[PDB]
Structure 1
Amino acid sequence: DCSKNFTSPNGTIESPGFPEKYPHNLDCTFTILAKPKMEIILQFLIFDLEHDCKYDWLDIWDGIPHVGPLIGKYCGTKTPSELRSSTGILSLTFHTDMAVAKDGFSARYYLVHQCNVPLGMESGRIANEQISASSTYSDGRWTPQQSRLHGDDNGWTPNLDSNKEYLQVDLRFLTMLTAIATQGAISRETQNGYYVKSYKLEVSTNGEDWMVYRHGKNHKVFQANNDATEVVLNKLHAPLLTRFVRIRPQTWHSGIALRLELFGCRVTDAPCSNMLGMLSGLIADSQISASSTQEYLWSPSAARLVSSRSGWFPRIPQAQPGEEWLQVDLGTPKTVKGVIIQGARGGITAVEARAFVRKFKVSYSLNGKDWEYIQDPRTQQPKLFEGNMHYDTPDIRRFDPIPAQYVRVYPERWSPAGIGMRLEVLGCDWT
C-alpha cells in the first residue's frame, strides 16, 4: 500500500524509495490533516519527474483527491512553489506509468499557528511561480517577477503597450481581496519614469471563468498612478472572494510599468468562519441532497463550491420560488454563521446561457425533520438574502449564528437561464 496520512506537527513526504529512482505503475495518496486554526505549510526540497504531464505527475489538491479543487499538476524538473493552506486538509496524489523513472521528490510539511493584510507581493509569500503575464518586454528586464511593490529593479512591462495586456497572480487558494496598491517604475538604465494611470480588474475561481470587476452597470476603472514612485491604494467598494487576479492596464504615462501589492485575508480569519466541507470533500456525496435534481447525469458533487464543473440544477430550473432547495448535512451539529453561494458553470460565451441564483432563503435543522427559516428582524419573516451577479464569482452571506446539522438554501430569484448553484456552508463547532 503506497498511500499515507500525516497528522504529526512536522514531517517528511517523499516518493517511494527516495533517494532511489521511483517505481513504475504507482498511484499513491499522501494526505496531511490539521485541526482548526492550524496552517499547513508544504515546501519541496527535491523534485524530478518524467516530462503536458501526460505520463508521470504529482497533483496537489485543496482537500480530497478528485473531489476538492486541483491546486496544480506538476512533472518535469521544476520544483513546486511553496503552499500554505488553511483548509485543514492538503492532499498529494503521485502517479507513475509503465516506463521511465527519475529521482522523484522529497517534501516537508509543518503545522503552525480586519481584512487588510498584504497577500505577499512585497513579502515574497506570493512565490515567483504564482506571478505571470499576457506578455513581457522583449529584453527580459521588465519581467512579471519584477512587479512586487517597492521592487528596486524596474517593473512589469508587456511586449507592446496596449489595453489588452495583464499581470496575473495565482493565489492558489480561494482568498478575500479587499484592495490593490500600484506603483510605476523608473528605468535604472535611462531614468525615464513610466506608470499606469488606470486599470481594470479581472478575477476567477478556476483560471477559466473570468469576471471583469464592475461598479454598477459598467466595468470599474480604478484610477492609478500620477508618478513613477508613489504608491496609490484603491479599496474595493465590494470585496471579492477569488483565486486568480488580473490587473489590466487601460491608460499609462510614456508606457506600461507596474509594481503591485494585493490586500485581503483568509475566509477563516473571521471568527467561526471555517468552510465546512463542500469545497474540500470532507462533506461526502451522501450528505448532499435536493428537492429535485436533473434526471440524467447528476452527481451530488456537482453542487460543490468551486470544485464542481457544473452545478446543482433542479429538474425544471425555471421553478416556482421557494419550492426548490439544496440541502447540506454537516455530519454533526455545528454553529453555522453563513453560506458561500456560487452560480453554475459549463456550456462561457453566451450571457443568457448563464445560470445563477440572485435571491434566496435559508432554513436549518438539528432534527433533519423540523425546519426553521432565518428571520428578517424588520419584516418578521424569512430573510431574503442577496445572491450572485455572475456565474463563477462566489459571494459570502453571513447571518446571526444558529445551531444546525442541516442547512437548506431555497432559490427565490434567478438569471434568465434558471436556477444553477454551487455551495459551501461556514461555521464552527456547536456550543
Structure 2
Amino acid sequence: HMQCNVPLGMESGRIANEQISASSTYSDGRWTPQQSRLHGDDNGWRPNLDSNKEYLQVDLRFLTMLTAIATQGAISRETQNGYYVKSYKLEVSTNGEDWMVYRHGKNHKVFQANNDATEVVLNKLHAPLLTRFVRIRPQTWHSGIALRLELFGCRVTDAPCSNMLGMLSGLIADSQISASSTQEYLWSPSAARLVSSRSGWFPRIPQAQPGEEWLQVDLGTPKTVKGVIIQGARGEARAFVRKFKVSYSLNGKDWEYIQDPRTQQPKLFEGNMHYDTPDIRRFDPIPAQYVRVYPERWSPAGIGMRLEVLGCDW
C-alpha cells in the first residue's frame, strides 16, 4: 500500500553522477564519489585521507522520506586488499547549508556498518526523516574508508492525494499567505515557504499565549486537504514549533479544527525537533480552501516555522 523501502537510485543511476560528491577522493583517481553505487564492481568511494571528518554526499534533488541506508566496502581492483567502513553517522539537510546529525534519544546515532568488503549491511532508521541532502560520515573503518551505498525511502507524493499544494513550488502566491502577526514589518509572505525559504515565519513577540498566533494559507479554490509538512526557521536564531493545532475553512470566515478521535477536542499534532529537518503530518481528508496552523508549544527561541499543505483537487 504505502511502500517506503524503495531504493532511491544509487545502484540504478536514478541518482545521477552529478548528485554524488564527497569531502575528498583518493589521489590516484580510482575511487571517485560516483563509484559509491551499491554492487558497483570498480572499487568504491574512498577519500584522500582517512578521518572522521570525511564524508560522502548525495543530493536527492527533491524532498524525500528516508527510511534506510545500505552499505558495502570495496575490494581494491589494484591491490585486492579489502577496505570498509565499520561505523558511521548520518547528516541531513533540506538545502545543503543547514545540517542535522541523526540522533537516538539523547545523542548521536552510531550506525554499525560493514565487517568485510563484500557483504551489504542494511540499517533502518528507527524514526524516518524528510530530507534532500544525505551525508555519510564514517567514524571507524578497516584499512581505509571505502563506500558503496544505497538509500531507501519514498516520495511523500506517492501516497494517494498527497501532492505538495504550492507553498514550496510557489504556485500558492505571496498574497495567498498571511499571519496573525509578523516580526518583520511588511514581511515577505514568501518567508513561510517549506524548504524554498531561507528564513521563516516569526510572529511579532516570539512568546504569546498558545493559540493566539497563526499562519494562514489560502489554497485559491476548494481542495481536498490530507496533511501538512511543518518545518522550523532560521531567523540570527533557529526556532521551531513542537506542537500545533490545525483549523480549516471554505468561506474563509467560519473555521473548524481537525479533531482528535480519542479526546473529542482539536488534535494536537507533533511538530519538529530541529530548525531545518521537516515533518509530515497526515490526517483524514477534509474539504478546505483555507488552512490555519496554530503553534501551541515551541522551542525556547520562539515560534519559527515554514509550511506546506498536502492534498489534491476534488
Do the two structures share a fold, i.e. TM-score over 0.5? yes
CA positional deviation for 1:331: 0.6
CA positional deviation for 1:305: 0.5
- Where does the alignment leave 5 or more consecutive residues of structure 1 unmatched? 1-112, 346-351
CA positional deviation for 1:287: 0.7
Task: Give the secondary-structure state (helix, strand or coil) at the position aligned to 1:251.
Answer: strand
Alignment correspondent of 2:238: 354
Structure 2 residue corresponding to 1:195, chosen from 80, 84, 93: 84
Deviations 1:272-326 (A, max 9, x none): 1000010001001111011111242511101111111211111111121010000
Task: Give the secondary-structure state (helix, strand or coil) at the position aligned to 1:261.
Answer: strand
Deviations 1:242-291 (A, max 9, x none): 11100000111121110001111111101110000100010011110111
Q: How does 1:234-313 map to 2 (within 5 A)?
A: 234-296=123-185, 298-313=187-202
Task: Give the secondary-structure state (helix, strand or coil) at the position aligned to 2:43.
Answer: coil
Rounded Cα–Cα distance in structure 1 between residues aligned with 2:266 and 2:204: 24
Decide whether the 8 Å contact of 1:184 with 1:194 is kept in 2: yes
C-alpha change, 1:139 and 1:411, in structure 2 (3 Å) is: same
CA positional deviation for 1:114: 0.4
Task: Give the secondary-structure state (helix, strand or coil) at the position aligned to 1:152.
Answer: coil
TM score, norm. by length of structure 2 = 0.97
Deviations 1:3-36 (A, max 9, x none): xxxxxxxxxxxxxxxxxxxxxxxxxxxxxxxxxx
Rounded Cα–Cα distance in structure 1 between residues aligned with 2:40 and 2:155: 25
Structure 2 residue corresponding to 1:397, chosen from 267, 278, 281: 281
Task: Give the secondary-structure state (helix, strand or coil) at the position aligned to 1:412.
Answer: strand
Larger radius of gyration: 1
Q: CA RMSD in A?
A: 1.5
Alignment correspondent of 2:14: 125
Decide whether the 8 Å contact of 1:341 with 1:387 is kept in 2: yes
Alignment correspondent of 2:257: 373
CA positional deviation for 1:423: 0.3
Rounded Cα–Cα distance in structure 2 between residues aligned with 1:332 and 1:171: 31
Rounded Cα–Cα distance in structure 2 between residues aligned with 1:241 and 1:137: 31
Alignment correspondent of 1:416: 300
Deviations 1:191-234 (A, max 9, x none): 21111011110011111001011111111111111111010111
The farther-off stretch of 291-300 and 405-414 is 291-300
Q: How does 1:42-191 map to 2 (within 5 A)?
A: 114-191=3-80
Rounded Cα–Cα distance in structure 1 between residues aligned with 2:153 and 2:144: 29
**Percentage of matched positions with identical amino acids:** 99
Decide whether the 8 Å contact of 1:180 with 1:234 is kept in 2: yes
Decide whether the 8 Å contact of 1:319 with 1:419 is kept in 2: no
Decide whether the 8 Å contact of 1:183 with 1:231 is kept in 2: yes
CA positional deviation for 1:124: 0.8
CA positional deviation for 1:190: 1.4
Deviations 1:71-125 (A, max 9, x none): xxxxxxxxxxxxxxxxxxxxxxxxxxxxxxxxxxxxxxxxxx9012111111011
CA positional deviation for 1:379: 1.3
CA positional deviation for 1:421: 0.6
TM score, norm. by length of structure 1 = 0.71
Task: Give the secondary-structure state (helix, strand or coil) at the position aligned to 2:115.
Answer: coil
Rounded Cα–Cα distance in structure 1 between residues aligned with 2:249 and 2:93: 33
Task: Give the secondary-structure state (helix, strand or coil) at the position aligned to 1:268.
Answer: helix
Rounded Cα–Cα distance in structure 2 between residues aligned with 1:295 and 1:182: 46
Decide whether the 8 Å contact of 1:179 with 1:263 is kept in 2: yes
Rounded Cα–Cα distance in structure 1 between residues aligned with 2:213 and 2:271: 15
Rounded Cα–Cα distance in structure 2 between residues aligned with 1:297 and 1:146: 49
CA positional deviation for 1:187: 1.1
Rounded Cα–Cα distance in structure 2 between residues aligned with 1:216 and 1:367: 43
The farther-off stretch of 294-303 and 115-124 is 294-303
Decide whether the 8 Å contact of 1:155 with 1:185 is kept in 2: yes
Higher relative contact order (CA 8 A, sep 6+): 2
